[PDB]
Protein: SARS-CoV2 spike 1-up conformation in complex with Fab47
Organism: Severe acute respiratory syndrome coronavirus 2
Amino acid sequence: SALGKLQDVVNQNAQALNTLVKQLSSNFGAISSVLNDILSRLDPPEAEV
Amino acid sequence: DSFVIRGDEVRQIAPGQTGKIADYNYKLPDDFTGCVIAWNSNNLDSKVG
């Protein structure tokens, strides 16, 4: 617990990157989080929306 | 563009929808700008038989 500042900086950056990667896998109100399945299941207007 | 169609298939003509008429005869574009105008022509365009 002496190198807390550098470890905290590294942990914050890693947490930000991991949060970004997890947030990539969010629906945001869409049918699915993957675009290929959305294209396969839906017609072009609804899939585009 | 003039095309004489069955009054039962105006629905396919509308942009983004598909159908027999729409996929094989006349297709509209997705970002189409214009007017889909129709008027029943029984007196002249239809003839007996």
